């Protein structure tokens, strides 16, 4: 899945909650 | 703790190399490594 | 092996980066979050709060409340200046205030400011001041006339103690620097429109406080390290 | 995340006074530009994205510098370190988080090794870092069994390997970390955040077996917060920090020094 | 081949010209509700300012090398436009520049009239030296190319016209809005310029968006009795706007 | 992005003269080959892609060389640098951008470290680069707290790590950067681009703790512009640059030297 | 881990590369762009502008306007050469001109050139020149005959001062080098078709300027470093 | 998404404006 | 970062390899190709041509 | 194929049983 | 394309016969 | 896009003509 | 600032190794590292 900001892709490669990148708002 | 290089300005504990001999920074705990310099 | 290609910048460590990273505690299950009143989502929420301005910052009062209030005299019959200050949010003496301190965490700012004043004299004590904002590009105003030619507000004390007025954002560019140089965003002078007045048997002086906050307008950007706080030599554990 | 725009205003002359209010209430007089000045009409672009908590504490900073001095002789009996974990030790960071009463978040830890050479050459160095939770056995010798790490989480770094890094889930046994804490012990002692924020300890130890070069390992620790929430803002700090988990500020024969600058007179700034 | 310009209560004419040129091709106009930052109602003096203001004529001779005025400034004394300019912090405007200079079918010469944005001159000295405010704000008079020492002169802009006063070569001067006055042909130039600058409005005092330059690229020769003709400059602001009103500064 | 082709032309003998015009207007006589010579018909391929602004300033060049000399003795009190940020310091680049009055763009910064060895060996070096915005506290010692970087953006480089690099959004508080600026200070002083282009400063400092080898770190800085726009072209520069943020050119006892070559006579080139 | 494979060239730094790269200022929000008249999208926009040619580059006039004009004599009654120059855009004296300087930033060029001339004598002064372009492959023409056998234009001064003429692009290859060697792209000689003439009581001399610009045709390629500008030893900050 | 020039793929892997490669025309 | 894995052979330089590689001249536009008689696509085209044999190769 | 935990992708790049990551539950 | 063994993906990244991995049976 | 030889994938990752691999026939 | 190697051609300040001794490039500020050479 890819989105818009202030497009680009980004799936979480890691099996765990914390490993994810920064949140959205 | 010699080998002609490393040597603390103290009678005991570990040793400090020649680079910090009267340089301005205090390395050996005794503080003797910086005592009576200024030649 | 899928043929790949290394990139200029690789393997570097950037304090502001944003990447994924394996976890050291697989299968851990955070404690369930709960109902904590008063949450926070964005710093601006704060800047919108009135904090008190250390108006009186003379070596005299310096470390007591008295630095936070001002004194009005019943014996001054004339257009006299009372106090003034630069505007630039991260300037003196604003810098120590809520909004201020925070602004001090960024580099650029923009918005209108909300200055409020509260009179503390007696209930029968009355006055008429004049809060005024003189747009940059000139010099601090020396006379009342010279001052009121700009944006102002004739505030009359009566029942409601407060009165808020605004310092419109009036710059050339859209944003301005938190930390100014020799530049300014104007000043807020304050004068005697009439004269403090009292009846018989009353304190001839009255206190005047001052708060500040940002408007719906206000906004910051460019994260940088605050300058209003340091650490000289280690902290004990 | 946008900011409203400014509407054009006109010369009012009404019986209602929005400018006049009362701060005694404890509310921030909700007055806007328009209400006080025949204003223009502006289509503001400005964005508050950056001012989000996630953008604020969303930056990595340093929280600790762990210096280890290698000692030829008694190799296996020293050359290892320990550390009471916490953010309380480094102003920069601490000041920020100490901007809210409670906070919740996950953490991104990043390491930065520096080998200060003491002989003519360094050889081959290899470090190890183990996370020892409160309750787990602390190491006591460069060769203690604990470094087997049958369960604790350790990370190995050798020379010429890029900075290591790893992620950490929100620990604590509560809903959030305590930035402050007006409470005590079950033995009415230790007033302070120390009363709770016991995350255990972080230890390292050079792995490379007995060798020939005296050297110094200096590993700095950086920390970025992720997925954040915070409650009850507090006024920011004003004086140098002195000790961990305590607010204290009075210092050995020196004046109470703020950041507020002084001036000659108030009718000129 | 003819022309008639009207502005405020003023009107220029010119029996013979090279059809006026529009700066960067964008007619002047007021400030867009979508760009502005100044959040207060701008004042628009209109006809009392967007009129034609005529300067102080300078003289061209068989030896003059050049001249130049900076804009705004130059107008700083011209009525309301002038006043307003100081009474406010912020100002915005574009203008129409008509440079006149008649002569005779029995002369010959050629002037280069160039309008330049952000014209940063260079002092004529070696080492850490700058230019003094006072010298880059002459006024309706302008700055002439005089070769003969000045005062507290190390704050003096160079006197090297042929390098456009900045390290570029006259001859590439054309890259800017410009016209030519060639006695044997026309007898007047005309430039209309919009507001150019990287921000909505700027301070009328501390910055000159433009800068008019005139350089005789061709020696003013003749056999007639009059061997010295004057050159006059008339300017008219357009869509004037001021913000942040307060006291008049000196 | 294509170029029109050239159409075949024929022997005109008309009353209208397109060749004859008047440059007094200030317009560039719009005459084309055809109008003046019985021409051929050509299907031009040529492309102006390369001549786009994005292709021009779209190349990385150098803007600064920051040499740092390590000093054993007083280690923590020196061995660090500072730098007033700007493009004004390196002809090559500067000349180009100084080809337009205003410009807007994002930047790609790329670093190039070089360790000149002074002892027989180098050991283990590790640099740090911090971006300190105007207003932020400048470092003053290889050990100043500022290097904690709780918010500023720093990038670490160690030996044997490929060149670092990062991207930067269009700064400034305006719509575009000022290449030139006929204005002054609020205190009628400092005529020049210096009046605005205050981007802060860039600092470095060797991280590796006190050690044994004297060495020299030379980090060059490269910069490529991206996503570009520019306004009002200006004539290019003609004389060596002398000082930043100023046009000045007269130099200490030396002739005014252009690039225009001279010749004996004009009736032979 | 997805099996990958490293590539010859990896980790190198190329000044002309083009890759993505994390940003040091996450969440920053550029200042909104605005209405800036006179924009630019492609260098060619410039080359299409007339710039003045430093025709007269003799050690004599060298650092004054006089280098930009030429002088015509009322006392020359015959087919005399007046001036000439090589064509190659990046040659002398073109190189210092707008188009020139820019061409000097690339390696290959191609297109037709637009040379314009403006007569500055008196209004009653009249003449008839002859601008001529002699295609490379030979030598500069010594006589008028020898010259006009090529592409030319008999320009008669009358009312309109100007007159533009064109130097067709006539090469063997499609493109040519900005910086030539011993090679050429022809020359532009200029002669007296008739004779300058004046009435009684008038300056016996007249000035003649010269501009150049590229045609719809013109075009460059191969980015390289200019040669018309150097930096010997550091710049002061 | 992938295009034609003077085909190939290219998505922006980065969450921010500036990080993107060179523009188009 | 997408978890990857390095491969035996990586970073080597093979004279016969075949990989992509950034270009040093972005936006360059090759000169248009043209009508050059007698082209060549495959060496065999040549071997199919009669060449003379140096039958008499005596030191003489 | 990608799933939910305590989303993200994960295919086994290896041709063998053992090489796979940790099991599910 | 991806299969079953004793699932997982695997396309040949190389333009030649020999470069391919081990055969199937 | 992927093809047959003497299958496999191959898209050009580069924005320019020359960067591409070897031609086909 | 000795160790038989590094040594500035000056009475004070820091020190320059033996490699820049009468080499043509000026290393110590005093300029004495290049004074009276040419043997
Ligand atoms: C293994 C690396 C250690 C990093 C631990 C981060 C924990 C932060 C919890 C905050 C406690 C405090 O108030 O100091
Ligand atoms: C941290 C690396 C610093 C690179 C900063 C690029 C900013 C360019 C702005 C142009 C200002 C000038 O005119 O010199
Ligand atoms: Ca010492
Ligand atoms: Ca030397």
Coordinates of N, CA, C and O in Angstrom, one line a residue, chain D residues 164-236:
Chain D
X164 N 25.1 -0.4 14.9 CA 24.0 -1.4 15.1 C 22.8 -0.6 15.5 O 22.9 0.6 15.8
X165 N 21.6 -1.2 15.5 CA 20.4 -0.6 15.9 C 19.3 -1.6 16.1 O 19.3 -2.6 15.5
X166 N 18.3 -1.2 17.0 CA 17.2 -2.1 17.2 C 16.1 -1.4 17.8 O 16.2 -0.3 18.3
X167 N 14.9 -2.0 17.8 CA 13.7 -1.4 18.2 C 13.2 -2.0 19.5 O 13.3 -3.2 19.8
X168 N 12.5 -1.2 20.3 CA 12.0 -1.6 21.6 C 10.6 -1.2 21.9 O 10.2 0.0 21.9
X169 N 9.7 -2.2 22.2 CA 8.3 -2.0 22.6 C 8.2 -1.3 23.9 O 9.0 -1.4 24.8
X170 N 7.1 -0.5 24.1 CA 6.8 0.2 25.3 C 6.9 -0.8 26.5 O 6.0 -1.6 26.6
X171 N 7.9 -0.6 27.3 CA 8.0 -1.5 28.5 C 7.0 -1.2 29.5 O 5.8 -1.2 29.3
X172 N 7.5 -0.9 30.7 CA 6.6 -0.6 31.9 C 5.4 -1.5 32.1 O 4.9 -2.1 31.2
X173 N 5.0 -1.5 33.4 CA 3.9 -2.3 33.7 C 2.7 -1.4 33.9 O 1.7 -1.8 34.6
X174 N 2.7 -0.3 33.3 CA 1.6 0.7 33.4 C 1.1 1.1 32.1 O 1.6 0.5 31.1
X175 N 0.3 2.1 32.1 CA -0.2 2.5 30.8 C 0.8 3.5 30.2 O 0.7 3.7 29.0
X176 N 1.6 4.0 31.0 CA 2.6 5.0 30.5 C 3.8 5.2 31.4 O 3.7 4.9 32.6
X177 N 4.9 5.8 30.9 CA 6.0 6.0 31.7 C 5.8 7.3 32.5 O 5.1 8.2 32.1
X178 N 6.3 7.2 33.8 CA 6.2 8.4 34.6 C 7.3 9.3 34.5 O 8.4 9.0 34.7
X179 N 7.0 10.6 34.0 CA 8.1 11.5 33.9 C 8.4 12.1 35.2 O 9.5 12.5 35.5
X180 N 7.4 12.2 36.1 CA 7.5 12.7 37.4 C 6.7 11.8 38.4 O 6.1 10.9 37.9
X181 N 6.8 12.0 39.7 CA 6.0 11.1 40.6 C 6.1 11.4 42.1 O 6.9 10.9 42.8
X182 N 5.1 12.2 42.5 CA 5.0 12.6 43.9 C 4.6 11.4 44.8 O 3.6 11.5 45.5
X183 N 5.5 10.4 44.9 CA 5.2 9.3 45.7 C 6.4 8.7 46.3 O 7.6 9.1 46.0
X184 N 6.2 7.7 47.2 CA 7.3 7.0 47.8 C 7.4 5.5 47.7 O 6.7 4.9 46.9
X185 N 8.2 4.9 48.5 CA 8.5 3.5 48.6 C 7.4 2.8 49.5 O 6.7 3.5 50.2
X186 N 7.5 1.5 49.6 CA 6.6 0.8 50.5 C 7.2 0.9 51.9 O 6.6 0.5 53.0
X187 N 8.4 1.5 51.9 CA 9.2 1.8 53.1 C 9.5 3.2 53.1 O 10.6 3.7 53.3
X188 N 8.4 4.0 52.9 CA 8.4 5.4 52.9 C 9.8 6.0 52.6 O 10.3 6.8 53.4
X189 N 10.4 5.6 51.5 CA 11.7 6.1 51.1 C 12.0 6.2 49.6 O 11.4 5.4 48.9
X190 N 12.8 7.1 49.2 CA 13.2 7.3 47.8 C 12.3 8.2 47.0 O 12.1 7.9 45.8
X191 N 11.6 9.1 47.6 CA 10.7 10.0 46.9 C 11.2 10.3 45.5 O 12.3 10.8 45.3
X192 N 10.5 9.9 44.5 CA 10.9 10.1 43.1 C 10.7 9.1 42.1 O 10.4 7.9 42.3
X193 N 10.9 9.5 40.8 CA 10.7 8.7 39.6 C 11.5 7.4 39.8 O 11.2 6.4 39.1
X194 N 12.5 7.5 40.6 CA 13.4 6.3 40.9 C 12.5 5.2 41.4 O 12.8 4.0 41.3
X195 N 11.5 5.6 42.1 CA 10.5 4.7 42.7 C 9.9 3.7 41.8 O 9.5 2.6 42.2
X196 N 9.9 4.1 40.5 CA 9.3 3.2 39.5 C 10.2 2.8 38.3 O 10.5 1.7 38.1
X197 N 10.6 3.8 37.5 CA 11.4 3.7 36.3 C 12.6 2.8 36.4 O 13.8 3.3 36.2
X198 N 12.4 1.6 36.8 CA 13.4 0.6 36.9 C 13.3 -0.3 35.7 O 12.4 -1.1 35.6
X199 N 14.1 -0.1 34.7 CA 14.1 -0.8 33.5 C 15.1 -1.9 33.4 O 15.2 -2.6 32.5
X200 N 16.0 -1.9 34.4 CA 17.0 -2.9 34.5 C 18.3 -2.2 34.2 O 18.5 -1.1 34.5
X201 N 19.3 -3.0 33.5 CA 20.6 -2.4 33.2 C 21.1 -2.9 31.9 O 20.8 -3.9 31.4
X202 N 22.0 -2.0 31.3 CA 22.6 -2.4 30.0 C 24.1 -2.6 30.2 O 24.8 -1.7 30.6
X203 N 24.6 -3.8 29.8 CA 26.0 -4.1 29.9 C 26.7 -4.5 28.6 O 26.1 -5.0 27.7
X204 N 28.0 -4.2 28.6 CA 28.8 -4.5 27.5 C 30.1 -5.2 28.0 O 30.3 -5.3 29.2
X205 N 30.9 -5.7 27.1 CA 32.1 -6.4 27.5 C 32.8 -6.8 26.2 O 32.3 -7.4 25.3
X206 N 34.1 -6.4 26.2 CA 34.9 -6.8 25.0 C 34.9 -8.3 24.9 O 35.2 -9.0 25.9
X207 N 34.7 -8.8 23.7 CA 34.7 -10.2 23.5 C 36.0 -10.8 23.1 O 36.4 -11.9 23.6
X208 N 36.7 -10.1 22.2 CA 38.0 -10.6 21.8 C 38.9 -11.0 23.0 O 39.0 -10.3 23.9
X209 N 39.3 -12.3 22.9 CA 40.1 -12.9 23.9 C 41.4 -12.1 24.3 O 41.7 -11.1 23.6
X210 N 42.1 -12.5 25.3 CA 43.3 -11.8 25.8 C 44.2 -11.5 24.6 O 44.5 -12.3 23.8
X211 N 44.7 -10.2 24.6 CA 45.6 -9.8 23.5 C 46.7 -8.8 23.8 O 47.1 -8.7 25.0
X212 N 47.1 -8.1 22.8 CA 48.3 -7.2 23.0 C 48.1 -5.7 23.0 O 49.0 -5.0 23.4
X213 N 46.9 -5.2 22.6 CA 46.9 -3.7 22.6 C 46.0 -3.1 23.6 O 44.9 -3.5 23.8
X214 N 46.5 -2.1 24.3 CA 45.7 -1.4 25.2 C 44.9 -0.4 24.4 O 45.5 0.2 23.4
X215 N 43.6 -0.3 24.6 CA 42.7 0.5 23.9 C 41.5 1.0 24.7 O 41.1 0.4 25.7
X216 N 40.8 2.0 24.2 CA 39.6 2.6 24.8 C 38.4 2.5 23.9 O 38.4 3.0 22.8
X217 N 37.3 1.9 24.4 CA 36.0 1.8 23.7 C 35.0 2.7 24.3 O 34.7 2.7 25.5
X218 N 34.5 3.6 23.4 CA 33.6 4.6 23.9 C 32.3 4.4 23.1 O 32.2 4.8 21.9
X219 N 31.3 3.8 23.6 CA 30.0 3.6 22.9 C 28.9 4.5 23.3 O 28.4 4.4 24.4
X220 N 28.5 5.4 22.4 CA 27.4 6.4 22.7 C 26.1 5.8 22.4 O 26.0 4.9 21.5
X221 N 25.0 6.2 23.1 CA 23.7 5.6 22.9 C 22.6 6.6 22.5 O 22.3 7.5 23.2
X222 N 22.1 6.4 21.3 CA 21.0 7.3 20.8 C 19.6 6.7 20.9 O 19.5 5.5 20.6
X223 N 18.6 7.6 21.1 CA 17.3 7.1 21.2 C 16.2 8.0 20.6 O 16.0 9.2 20.9
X224 N 15.4 7.4 19.7 CA 14.3 8.0 19.1 C 13.0 7.4 19.5 O 12.9 6.2 19.6
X225 N 12.0 8.2 19.7 CA 10.7 7.7 20.2 C 9.7 7.5 19.0 O 9.8 8.3 18.1
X226 N 8.9 6.5 19.1 CA 8.0 6.2 18.0 C 6.6 5.9 18.5 O 6.4 5.4 19.6
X227 N 5.6 6.2 17.7 CA 4.2 5.9 18.0 C 3.9 6.6 19.3 O 3.6 5.9 20.3
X228 N 3.8 7.9 19.3 CA 3.6 8.5 20.6 C 2.3 9.2 21.1 O 1.5 9.6 20.3
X229 N 2.2 9.3 22.4 CA 1.1 9.9 23.1 C 1.6 10.5 24.4 O 2.5 9.9 25.0
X230 N 1.1 11.6 24.8 CA 1.5 12.2 26.0 C 0.4 13.0 26.7 O -0.5 13.5 26.0
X231 N 0.4 13.0 28.0 CA -0.6 13.7 28.8 C -0.2 14.8 29.8 O 0.9 14.7 30.3
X232 N -1.0 15.7 30.0 CA -0.8 16.8 31.0 C 0.5 17.4 30.8 O 1.5 17.0 31.3
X233 N 0.6 18.5 30.0 CA 1.8 19.2 29.7 C 2.2 19.9 31.0 O 1.4 20.2 31.9
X234 N 3.5 20.2 31.2 CA 4.0 20.8 32.4 C 4.8 22.0 31.9 O 5.2 22.1 30.8
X235 N 5.2 22.9 32.9 CA 6.0 24.0 32.4 C 7.4 23.4 32.2 O 7.8 22.5 32.9
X236 N 8.1 23.9 31.2 CA 9.5 23.4 30.9 C 10.4 23.7 32.1 O 10.2 24.5 32.9

